[PDB]
């Protein structure tokens, strides 16, 4: 998939990898969790995602990436159980004093470390919004664990929207600020222009995620919620046609992104110099998420 | 019009009006035409027909706060200054958070009344609801700021996009969090964010936003293509006259009613996620969405259109 933005990569990946291996050990997640870390190039992923982060920020993002792929994904199947695991993790984020088994397990305690560090230096506006976004992601992850289109009418745009709504980029997008040492003011963070840029970012990454994981989950057939399998079942396409449809949906969303991006100036009229710089760095960060995901999938 | 849901009414509207008159005076916000002419107490009764009396009174205070004091903040030529509207909304947002050095709107009557509404809203609600409801308050204040500056002047826009923007910015996003609080239950967070409930809330807010725009179109018509109101947008960007824009708004409402009825059938998709207490919470929440749409539709037909 072609993309119009330049690829950038953090030069501190090697230091972040060393930090992350020690952290996996400290957090009791270390067994081929480290092997999955290095061979899946999750330190490279973090370096593509946040190529302008502080070193501390890159290290936080690297820890979060390995947490997503090894201990979080390892927890996942039936809907009540996945709903309970996601609810227990959510409890970690709210500092619920009565910690269920999930919060006390390594994946839960590690999430607690990640969230404590994520909150460092961020205003209560950011903390509330990021907590809400984590909760929405965990709920949506539960929703996507059950077949949603078996014997139902659904168009490609609805499917893409669901996969974007469920995509982990919604959590990751909040870390552009945190890893870069700035914060978008809450009154402009919720501006509809920025909302739609975030929606598009998450949909393009969801399409990419689904494209690269379709062959693995092809066994699910019409019980899959993966966009490619859904297209094969609800548009009757074969796999090549499904790929070209995915490339088309991606291209449609790139064009929409450039168009909506033209209205970011609407946001600047309520901002001093620093707020304008924050918005610029945030929007550039969304470029890096899409382009970085693209490059990581390519090189992996 | 011709909605599939029944109109229901809380029995304690008279007590709620009396309470709210007392509340306005105590908060320094006293003005009675909000009830005498505009029937806000009756609207609250249609919105929350199954609340406790305490809950009905909280909803009444909130809706009256929105209608008179909050909206009063944006009256006259001054109320059109987008940097000032941004200032008021930012300072009201500040009321809700622990900020080191607050600005002057936090200690103004409108701001202190909002503090009282938020404290009462939190009573008995879990940290999940408190986080979510404050997030929704914050997004509402930000979206109100965004809607205070022309968004479509010299630009192309379609009806679906405009309706989505007015729904995103609608105060019904804050109001619907009060179904739980005024009713004494709570939707579990893992199902509150389920795509089915998300879409039902989006549809609800879009329908109420269409209805609200029907009532404010004559207020802003002098703004022409600088207005963000759905009807004026349809005039300037689809070339319709006013009766035509109203008919298009009726069609957009009908299509969202139909969609609502469709995805509402999928509310059973969250039963495999819940216990008995949860399924009941979801049921009462979805029914409360009916009451908001139906009550607003009634009030628009009889009163809101008069502006």
């Amino acid at each position: 998939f072609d993309l119009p933005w330049p690829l950038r990569k953090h030069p501190g990946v090697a230091g972040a990898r060393e930090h992350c291996l020690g952290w996996l050990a400290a957090q009791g997640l270390a067994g081929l969790t480290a092997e999955t870390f290095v061979t899946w190039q999750l330190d490279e992923l973090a370096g593509y995602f946040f190529p302008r982060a502080t070193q501390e920020g890159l290290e936080l993002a690297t820890d979060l990436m390995v947490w997503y792929f090894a201990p979080f994904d390892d927890q996942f199947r039936d809907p009540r159980r996945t709903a309970g695991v996601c609810a227990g993790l959510a409890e970690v984020l709210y500092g619920v004093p009565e910690p269920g088994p999930v919060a006390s397990s390594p994946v839960g305690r590690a999430l607690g470390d990640l969230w404590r560090r994520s909150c460092t230096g961020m205003s209560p506006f950011w903390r509330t919004r990021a907590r809400h976004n984590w909760t929405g992601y965990l709920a949506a992850h539960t929703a996507e664990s059950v077949p949603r289109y078996h014997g139902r009418t659904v168009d490609a745009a609805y499917c893409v929207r669901q996969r974007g709504y469920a995509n982990s980029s919604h959590v990751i997008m909040d870390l552009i600020e945190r890893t870069g040492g700035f914060e978008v003011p809450a009154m402009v963070w919720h501006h509809p222009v920025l909302v739609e840029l975030r929606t598009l970012t998450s949909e393009m990454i969801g399409i990419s995620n689904d494209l690269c994981s379709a062959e693995k989950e092809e066994a699910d057939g019409d019980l899959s919620n993966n966009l490619l399998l859904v297209l094969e079942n609800h548009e009757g396409l074969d796999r090549p046609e499904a790929i070209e449809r995915a490339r088309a949906l991606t291209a449609e969303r790139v064009a929409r992104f450039l168009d909506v991006e033209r209205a970011v100036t609407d946001v600047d009229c309520l901002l001093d110099g620093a707020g304008r710089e924050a918005v610029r760095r945030f929007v550039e960060g969304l470029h890096d998420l899409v382009r970085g995901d693209n490059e990581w999938e390519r090189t992996t």
Side-chain angles (χ1 to χ4, degrees), chain A residues 64-76 78-97 99-108 110-119:
Chain A
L64 175 63
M65 297 297 99
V66 195
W67 179 94
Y68 262 130
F69 280 76
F72 173 74
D73 271 1
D74 281 359
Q75 295 292 329
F76 310 108
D78 79 280
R80 196 76 209 260
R81 191 210 174 251
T82 170
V85 166
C86 289
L89 293 179
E91 286 175 27
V92 171
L93 306 165
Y94 289 70
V96 167
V102 173
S104 317
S105 67
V107 63
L111 179 62
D113 182 63
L114 288 173
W115 172 244
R116 169 190 68 75
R117 291 160 55 198
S118 297
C119 285

Side-chain angles (χ1 to χ4, degrees), chain A residues 5 26 50 71 82 88 108 115 131 133 199 221 228 242 259 271:
Chain A
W5 307 291
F50 303 100
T82 170
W115 172 244
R131 206 178 274 112
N133 287 340
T199 302
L228 262 70
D259 205 26
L271 293 185

Side-chain angles (χ1 to χ4, degrees), chain A residues 9 18 39 55 63 79 82 89 100 130 136 145-146 155 159 185 228 249 256 258 265 268 283-284 287:
Chain A
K9 193 225 260 192
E18 185 189 311
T39 62
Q55 188 59 31
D63 293 344
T82 170
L89 293 179
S145 74
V146 64
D155 49 62
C159 184
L228 262 70
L249 297 149
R256 184 58 180 163
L258 306 171
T265 177
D268 292 348
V283 171
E284 289 191 23
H287 301 166

Side-chain angles (χ1 to χ4, degrees), chain A residues 58-76 78-97 99-108 110-149 151-152 154-213:
Chain A
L58 183 64
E59 275 158 26
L60 174 58
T62 305
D63 293 344
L64 175 63
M65 297 297 99
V66 195
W67 179 94
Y68 262 130
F69 280 76
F72 173 74
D73 271 1
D74 281 359
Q75 295 292 329
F76 310 108
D78 79 280
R80 196 76 209 260
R81 191 210 174 251
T82 170
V85 166
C86 289
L89 293 179
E91 286 175 27
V92 171
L93 306 165
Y94 289 70
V96 167
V102 173
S104 317
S105 67
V107 63
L111 179 62
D113 182 63
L114 288 173
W115 172 244
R116 169 190 68 75
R117 291 160 55 198
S118 297
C119 285
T120 299
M122 311 306 297
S123 76
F125 298 93
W126 187 95
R127 297 197 304 270
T128 289
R129 171 243 298 185
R131 206 178 274 112
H132 181 91
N133 287 340
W134 260 113
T135 311
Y137 163 75
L138 292 166
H141 195 254
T142 300
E144 294 297 298
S145 74
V146 64
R148 291 188 60 194
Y149 312 121
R152 300 171 138 174
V154 153
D155 49 62
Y158 184 88
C159 184
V160 173
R161 181 172 319 121
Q162 304 310 292
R163 303 301 276 182
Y165 177 84
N167 198 256
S168 58
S169 60
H170 284 289
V171 164
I172 297 160
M173 283 181 312
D174 288 334
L175 291 186
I176 302 168
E177 292 153 289
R178 162 62 179 84
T179 62
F182 68 98
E183 178 176 334
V184 173
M187 291 300 99
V188 309
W189 165 270
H190 290 285
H191 194 284
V193 169
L194 293 194
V195 173
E196 189 171 6
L197 291 184
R198 290 192 294 271
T199 302
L200 291 158
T201 298
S202 69
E203 290 185 353
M204 290 184 280
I205 295 170
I207 294 164
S208 167
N209 287 172
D210 279 2
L211 183 74
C212 301
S213 74

Side-chain angles (χ1 to χ4, degrees), chain A residues 3-9 48 51 284 287-288 291-292:
Chain A
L3 292 175
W5 307 291
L7 166 77
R8 320 188 292 174
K9 193 225 260 192
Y48 288 134
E284 289 191 23
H287 301 166
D288 291 326
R291 184 61 175 94

